[PDB]
Design a protein around this ligand. Sequence first.
Ligand SMILES: [Cl-]
Lengths: 102, 15
Amino acid sequence: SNYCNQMMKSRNLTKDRCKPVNTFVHESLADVQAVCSQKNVACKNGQTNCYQSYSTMSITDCRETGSSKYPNCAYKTTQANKHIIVACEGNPYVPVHFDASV
Amino acid sequence: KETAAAXFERXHLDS
Ligand SMILES: [Cl-]
């Protein structure tokens, strides 16, 4: 099956439900973690602990189809190069939510 | 308990 359906289930996003949307980043972990010291921007929710990558990154967007329902979740796969925006927290100060891509 | 950092990785990283 398509990348979204397969990886959604493999990663335990869709073994127990169907998630409307999820994004996967094809960069090294350390290059994603590096975003938490890049450009500070507001989060969608207005908190201020979000960070936008300087560079675009390889990303796959997965979004449920209109008819998709558990257990037979169904996704549309869209691949793109886009900047990512992550929320960071902690010591070490690392990504804890994927806010958006642009 | 899975931490928030590990959650993000499992959901969003595919290097
Ligand atoms: Cl935590």
